[PDB]
With several copies, the nearest count.
Chain A
Amino acid sequence: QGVYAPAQAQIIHAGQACVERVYTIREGDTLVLQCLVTGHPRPQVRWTKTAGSASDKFQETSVLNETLRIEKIQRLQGGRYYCKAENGVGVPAIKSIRVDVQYLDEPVLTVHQTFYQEKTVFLRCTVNSNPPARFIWKRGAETLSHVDIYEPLYTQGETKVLKLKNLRPQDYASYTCQVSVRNVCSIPDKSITFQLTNTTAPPALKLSVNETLVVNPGDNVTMQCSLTGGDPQPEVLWSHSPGPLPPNSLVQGGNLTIWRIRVEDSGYYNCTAINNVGNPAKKTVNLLVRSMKNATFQITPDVIKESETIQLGQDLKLSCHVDAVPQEKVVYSWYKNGKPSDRLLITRNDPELPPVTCSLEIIDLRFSDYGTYLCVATFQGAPIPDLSVEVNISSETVPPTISVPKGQSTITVREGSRAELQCEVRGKPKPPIIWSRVDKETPMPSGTMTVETYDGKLRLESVSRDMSGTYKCQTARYNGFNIRPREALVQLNVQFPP
């Protein structure tokens, strides 16, 4: 190719700048970079950026334009940009440039108090700035070693501390941290002052409720968090974990009220006071709303005889469980065609099975034991309702078996439409089915590894090809026999156009 020439790029500076390879501008101004290019055929030009996907100044910024334009630039918009120019002939042309947005936030001034001869206060001054800031201390007059100044470790020049080793009376004055960025990009210095007095003291709080607070649903609970010390006057703030405070909870400021409290509102509510003096004070209360859910039973045939079925002359455990908030406070009652038990039939409250599960054993099973058993979980004198689980034992009760009906082992569907996977379980009682995926370890439409279902149906509203694969269905270990779960597989084809 005689005349065809490889691309050649050159970056030029424009828009607002300040003062070699780097383009420094003040935050809020406008960036204008132009990429002049040559070569034949005329190469195309795109400005792009290079930034770690998962941290700090990152944007996905691919513009097809010989001019890069960022109006009202920001901290994060900063970084390294490269102009790429190609035309097919030879190697693409690349030129790099570092845009260095500069700034100087308002400094923060905090102070801390502290043998037994001299009292010492530390005045810490912190500020975020680009470039690194310069600190100057003054007590009306500029201070030098004549007390000590320095930068501690675990600070990249953003912090300086003024140490007052001996706190003499003249030192009780207004200290002001004046931080400068060398006026580069014509950026003004900034100052913050603090009134150091012998009454200056960190915050302190008092809470109107105990460490841990138990409550019933619907109850209204109000918590007064009041200051008991602090100069300057600290600011009190409430917070919640996990998640935010509302709905149905309002902060007057100091006063925290929760109306018609729901069970999900349980958790930690922390009151914190701050005045930029010492460590902030924090009072913490753990609010527990009572609840009972998911009552479940288990049929456990003779384990030592290695049985999976009810057989006369064997041990038969009938367990019971419920999920509760004050888990330690639950109590179970076992009824049997009415409410009775010493000989032959015995109670056991805490075996290897899930936590706090009451389970009676029937030694030497007998036709006389064939009946309807009931377990009743309750809270000692709580307004909440009781929960129960019925479990009929009879000659009919039998461990389960699972299979795929007819020939729906492999079921094909077109993408987008709805899909319905099917397993059918047999036994008395029938436990729920737990669906999982086997070809890979991925989650599901519900977003978790497994889904519960009683009808043995797995419904897929918007079936995606990603779902195409193999699926496992198996019997639960609860609400039925506590036995090796029975398994069965089904294939799911998600057809899609070519």
Chain B
Amino acid sequence: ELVDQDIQPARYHIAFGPVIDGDVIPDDPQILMEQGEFLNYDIMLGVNQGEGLKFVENIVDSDDGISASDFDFAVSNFVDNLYGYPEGKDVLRETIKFMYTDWADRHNPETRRKTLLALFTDHQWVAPAVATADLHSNFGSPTYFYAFYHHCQTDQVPAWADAAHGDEVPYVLGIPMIGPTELFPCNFSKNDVMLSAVVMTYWTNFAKTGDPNQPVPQDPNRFEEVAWTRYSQKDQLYLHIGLKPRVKEHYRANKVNLWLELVPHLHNL
């Protein structure tokens, strides 16, 4: 009787879930993390290139593109739901549109789709993850960061979609090694098996020693000479997980800092 009830929460929010009770959860995670009120665990975290596929999938026209008006609408809905501020939502919406507009090739409805997808991805996954990594490393927690830029496209997802939310799971679980399953029907390639082995090696290495690089080496395997450096707020090194893996720095620094530093400022303190 309780489960079958229809309880709709605010958009982008939840009704029933974890709460700040002051016991299990002593305080707002934001406050606890900013003030370093947490123990120093070994941490590994990351995000996927195109988390927000479903965010735009429903507003895409028959041409796989998004109109300028639809773009404005999405942002408008986005601003109202997440930033329910009465005075100043106008400047916010316009600023957000500008940042996520590709001024080189600004008229392309398909590029518009990509950047809009990036907006939701950056806000809901990338920015929070970086904030967590920055605070954990800053307060002494050994941190490792990754970006997943690979996936296996089924005939059920658009051909233009990049790695979406959850697409890394099959690799982490080694599904490619036992071939397509009822739950994961994608026709995994040799490269999928190779990448799956790599992910599992990194994941279990972390579990065994707290270091993705120890004790099992990456044994053509493109990760043979790629050591996963620890993440720090100063260099912000992260592992680019794909068929052409390598260590990079400051993942989407510009867009991430927009949400973490400037937008909060526009709140008028």
Chain A: residues with CB nearer than 8 A to chain B?
21, 50-57, 79-80, 82, 94-96, 98, 112, 114-118, 120, 122, 124, 148, 150-154, 157, 161, 163, 165, 279, 281-282
Q: How large is the interface on B (under 10, 10 to 19, 20 to 34, 35 or more residues)?
A: 35 or more
B67, A279: Cβ atoms under 8 Å? yes
A153, B265: Cβ atoms under 8 Å? yes
Residue of A50, A95, A150, A151 near B38 (CB, 8 A) is A50
Residues of B within 8 A of A150 (CB): 90
29 contacts across the A-B interface (CB closer than 8 A): A21-B22, A21-B26, A50-B39, A52-B40, A53-B40, A53-B139, A54-B140, A56-B36, A56-B139, A57-B36, A79-B37, A82-B26, A94-B23, A95-B23, A96-B22, A96-B26, A98-B27, A112-B69, A114-B77, A115-B11, A116-B11, A118-B8, A148-B80, A153-B94, A153-B97, A154-B72, A163-B76, A279-B61, A279-B70
Residues of A within 8 A of B98 (CB): 153
Whole-angstrom CA separation of A327 from B9 in the bound complex:
57
Nearest B-chain residue to A124, judged by Cβ: B69
Nearest B-chain residue to A120, judged by Cβ: B77
Residues of A within 8 A of B9 (CB): 115, 117
Contacts A116-B8, A282-B62 given: A52-B73 contact, CB under 8 Å? no
Residues of A within 8 A of B12 (CB): 115
Whole-angstrom CA separation of A404 from B3 in the bound complex:
77
Q: How far is the CB of B235 from chain A (nearest CB, A)?
A: 16
Q: How far is the CB of B19 from chain A (nearest CB, A)?
A: 14
Whole-angstrom CA separation of A55 from B141 in the bound complex:
10
B72, A152: Cβ atoms under 8 Å? yes
A55, B8: Cβ atoms under 8 Å? no
B140, A52: Cβ atoms under 8 Å? yes
Known pairs A21-B26, A52-B36, A115-B8 / 6 extra A-B pairs, C-beta < 8 Å:
A54-B139, A57-B36, A120-B77, A122-B73, A165-B80, A279-B67
Across the A-B interface, give the 7 residue pairs with the lowest CB-CB distance, nearest first. Answer: A54-B140, A52-B139, A117-B8, A52-B36, A80-B37, A96-B26, A53-B140
Interface positions of B from 1 to 59, Cβ below 8 Å from A: 8-12, 22-23, 26-27, 32, 35-40
Nearest B-chain residue to A95, judged by Cβ: B23
Is B138 positioned at the interface, with any CB of A under 8 Å from its CB?
Answer: yes
Is B216 positioned at the interface, with any CB of A under 8 Å from its CB?
Answer: no
Residues of A within 8 A of B260 (CB): none
A117, B139: Cβ atoms under 8 Å? no
A117, B27: Cβ atoms under 8 Å? no
Residues of B within 8 A of A80 (CB): 26, 32, 35, 37
Residues of B within 8 A of A115 (CB): 8-9, 11-12
Q: How far is the CB of B16 from chain A (nearest CB, A)?
A: 14
